[PDB]
Write a protein that binds this ligand. Structure first.
Ligand SMILES: [Zn+2]
Length: 503
RNA sequence: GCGCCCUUAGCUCAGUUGGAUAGAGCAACGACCUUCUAAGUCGUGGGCCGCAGGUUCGAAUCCUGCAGGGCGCGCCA
C-alpha cells in the first residue's frame, strides 16, 4: 500500500478555449502558434474557421507514486500539478508544457540580472560589520555565512501542510495582484496539501530536515534522505513575508509558485527564494534544480529563461539547454530531435531501458542542432501516409478496437459540440508511434508481461488471473495498451493500471 | 525587475563627499619612571587604496560595467 505506481487510463477531457488560463484561445493574428507549425498553418488557415481549437488535456487521475518511479515521470514530462498528473502533446494543443531543469554549477545568467544580486546583500548587512573585503568571484560565500550571524532575515524549513499564518497574505495578495476577490478556502487545501507523493515520503524523518536547515555548514558528501515537497518560510522579526513552495526529488528540486505579503514586501521577496535556493545544491550533494513547468505560448514566463532552464523532449527523452534553442522553441512550434539516421518516410524507433526512458541521455555542449520535427507530422512530412496505413494493420493483426480516421478528421469538428468526442488521437509525438508497437508484437516482448498483469476495473472490483489474452474484452484491452503508448514501456511492468470509462 | 546612494587604515570620521589619507580613541617605541615606559602626562611611529577600464597636467573622490557596500515596491502556475 502507498508504494506502487498508480496511474489511470488517460482520457482527453476537453473544454472550450475560454476556460484556458494562459492563452484564452485568442492570440491575435498569430494563428501559426495556435496549430503545430507553419506548414499546416498555410493550409489550415481557411479550415480553422470550420474546426474548433479547444484546450486538450492528456493526463490521468493518479492516487500515489513512489519517489523513485516518479523521478522518471517528472523527467518524462508528466509534471505534477494537483492530483491530475497530466501532460500536453507538442503537436495539437494550444498550451504546451514540458519539464525544465537548471544547473547551478555553470548557469549562464544574463548580465541584466547580475545587478539584482548586488542589491539584496548590501541592505541585509549590519552597516559597519563586514566579513572582510576579499574577492567574491563565487557568490556563495557572502550569503551562506551572513544569514546566521545576524537577525536581519532568517528562514526555516517546513513540510507541505496547513498553517493559519500564511492565510492572511494568501488571500490579500491574490486580491492585490491577482484580482481574485473570491477565494474559497479550498483553493489552499487542494493546491499545496494533497500531493501525489507518498505521505511517508513527505514526512520521512526530521533528521533529513535537521541537516537540511544545517545546509549552511554541513560538509559535502553527507548522505541526504529528503524526497518530496518542501516549504521554506521567510521570517522577518516575528512574522512572515514570503512562502517558498518547491519539491525536492531524490535527484533534484522542482519549484512551483511564490507568495508575498502585499504591503510587507519591503525586502524584494520575489527574487530572494530563487537566488537562495539554487545555492542549496552547492552546499548539499544534490544535482538538479527543476524550475517547474515551462510554457512558451505564455509570454510571461520569459523570466524563467534567465534561470538557465532546459526545454525537454518527450518523444525521445533527450534534454537540450534552453538558451541554445531559444529561437528554435519560439512561436510554439513542435520540437522533436532526430538522429543521424533521419528519414522522411519511416517512423521513429523507440528504446525502452532502465536508464533510457527519461533517465538522462548523453549530451554535448557545443553542437549545432537542427530541427527535424517539421518533416514528421506536418504537411511537408511524408510520415503521415505511413502512419495512415499503420492503423490498418493494427486492427487486422490481433483484434484491438483502433480504427483509423479520415484525412480531414485530425481535429474534432465544430459540429461535435453536441456529442463529446471521447478518444485518444493516434498522431501524437508524446504517445508512442505505431512503428515501435508493431515491432513489440513481432519480437514477442509483449508476451512476458502478458499473463502477469491483472484486470482491474473500478466499477467491477474483481480479481481474476489472465490466462488467454484474447478472452478479455477488446475495449478494455484498448485502454491497457494506451498507457503503454504514453507511460514508458518497461515502467508499466512495476505498476498497476486502472481505467476510466466516460468520466 | 527598474530608480537615485556611497566604494579611504583592524574602527568611527573628515578634503563644498575632486587637487597631499589627516587629527582622535587603539595597540608600538620613547627625554615621559616614587616598580603606574603591562590602568599619569607629553613627542607620535610601522597600521598607505578596493575589480576593470572611461574621457583630461589629475583618481581615497562625477562612475557606463562586475564582484562585494544603501533606499518605494514590481509583466512573480
Ligand atoms: Zn489553451
Amino acid at each position: 500500500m502507498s508504494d506502487r505506481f498508480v496511474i489511470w487510463a488517460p482520457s482527453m477531457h476537453n473544454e472550450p478555449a475560454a476556460k484556458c488560463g494562459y492563452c484564452h484561445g485568442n492570440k491575435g493574428g498569430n494563428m501559426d502558434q495556435l496549430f503545430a507549425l507553419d506548414s499546416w498553418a498555410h493550409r489550415y488557415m481557411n479550415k480553422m474557421d470550420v474546426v474548433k481549437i479547444e484546450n486538450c488535456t492528456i493526463g490521468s487521475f493518479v492516487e500515489h507514486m513512489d519517489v523513485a518511479t516518479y523521478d522518471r515521470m517528472c523527467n518524462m514530462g508528466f509534471r505534477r500539478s494537483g492530483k491530475f498528473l497530466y501532460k500536453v502533446d507538442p503537436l495539437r494543443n494550444c498550451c504546451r508544457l514540458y519539464t525544465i531543469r537548471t544547473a547551478p554549477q555553470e548557469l549562464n545568467m544574463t548580465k541584466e540580472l547580475k545587478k539584482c544580486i548586488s542589491r539584496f546583500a548590501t541592505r541585509i548587512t549590519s552597516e559597519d560589520y563586514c566579513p572582510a573585503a576579499v574577492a567574491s568571484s563565487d557568490f556563495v560565500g557572502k550569503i551562506v555565512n551572513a544569514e546566521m550571524n545576524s537577525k536581519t532575515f532568517y528562514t526555516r524549513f517546513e513540510p507541505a501542510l496547513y498553517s493559519e499564518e500564511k492565510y492572511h497574505l494568501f488571500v490579500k495578495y491574490q486580491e492585490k495582484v491577482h484580482q481574485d476577490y473570491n477565494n474559497s478556502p479550498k483553493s489552499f487545501k487542494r493546491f499545496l496539501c494533497d500531493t501525489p507523493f507518498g505521505p511517508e515520503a513527505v514526512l520521512g524523518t526530521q533528521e533529513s530536515w535537521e541537516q537540511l536547515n544545517n545546509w549552511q555548514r554541513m560538509k559535502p558528501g553527507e548522505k541526504l534522505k529528503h524526497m518530496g515537497p518542501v516549504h521554506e518560510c521567510y521570517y522577518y522579526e516575528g512574522k512572515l513575508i514570503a512562502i517558498t513552495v518547491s519539491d525536492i526529488l531524490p535527484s533534484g528540486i522542482s519549484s512551483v509558485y511564490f507568495i508575498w505579503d502585499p504591503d510587507y514586501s519591503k525586502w524584494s521577496l520575489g527574487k530572494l527564494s530563487a537566488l537562495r535556493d539554487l545555492a542549496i545544491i552547492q552546499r548539499t550533494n544534490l544535482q538538479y534544480y527543476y524550475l517547474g513547468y515551462y510554457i512558451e505560448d505564455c509570454p510571461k514566463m520569459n523570466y524563467k529563461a534567465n534561470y538557465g532552464a532546459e526545454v525537454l523532449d518527450v518523444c525521445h527523452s533527450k534534454y537540450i539547454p534552453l538558451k541554445p534553442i531559444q529561437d528554435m522553441i519560439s512561436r510554439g512550434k513542435l520540437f522533436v530531435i532526430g538522429e543521424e539516421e533521419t528519414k522522411v518516410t519511416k517512423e521513429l524507433y523507440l528504446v525502452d531501458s532502465e536508464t533510457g526512458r527519461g533517465e538522462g541521455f548523453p549530451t554535448d555542449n557545443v553542437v549545432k542542432y537542427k530541427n527535424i520535427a517539421e518533416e514528421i507530422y506536418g504537411v511537408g512530412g511524408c510520415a503521415f501516409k505511413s502512419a495512415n496505413e499503420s492503423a490498418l494493420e493494427l486492427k487486422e493483426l490481433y483484434g484491438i478496437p483502433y480504427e483509423e480516421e479520415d484525412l480531414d478528421t485530425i481535429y474534432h469538428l465544430k459540429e461535435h459540440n453536441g456529442h463529446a468526442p471521447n478518444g485518444i488521437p493516434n498522431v501524437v509525438p508524446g504517445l508512442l508511434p505505431l512503428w515501435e508497437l508493431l515491432d513489440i508484437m513481432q519480437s514477442g516482448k509483449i508476451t512476458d508481461l502478458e499473463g502477469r498483469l491483472f484486470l482491474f476495473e473500478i466499477e467491477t472490483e474483481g480479481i481474476r488471473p489472465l490466462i488467454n489474452f484474447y478472452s478479455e474484452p477488446p475495449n478494455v484491452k484498448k485502454r491497457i495498451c494506451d498507457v503503454i503508448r504514453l507511460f514508458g514501456f518497461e515502467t508499466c511492468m512495476k505498476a498497476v493500471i486502472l481505467y476510466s470509462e466516460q468520466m
